[PDB]
Amino acid sequence: GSSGSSGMPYVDRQNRICGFLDIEDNENSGKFLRRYFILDTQANCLLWYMDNPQNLAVGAGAVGSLQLTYISKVSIATPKQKPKTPFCFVINALSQRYFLQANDQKDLKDWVEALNQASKSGPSSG
Secondary structure (H helix, E strand, C coil), X not given: CCCCCCCCCCCCCCCCEECCEEEEXXXXXXXXXXXXXXXXXXXXXXXXXXXXXXXXXXXXXXXXXXXXXXXXXXXXXXXXXXXXXXXXXXXXXXXXXXXXXXXXXXXXXXXXXXXXXXXXXXXXXX
């Protein structure tokens, strides 16, 4: 482990983000799973639910999750990886790249940003 300090970082309060993305079902090369992704900093993981959790049932859950512990970098995909997509970001983790789709250019960036904030865990954790 060993936690190293930094001179003087910047940015903070990644702030949780929500929306509806389309992750390419691992069980299909073309079909995307439209779920409501929610960048939870407290959980330090990514949870995407069929729909808002406020409409779901207390005894509900997420179709899938993504531990931030994996994610390393969140950059915009490329036409050499997954073209035909304007606002598409690739979540770089251990050594993989998740292809997700955004509604507009905002959500996209935002997400990318949020995913870039929750990943950078700001200046420090907590």
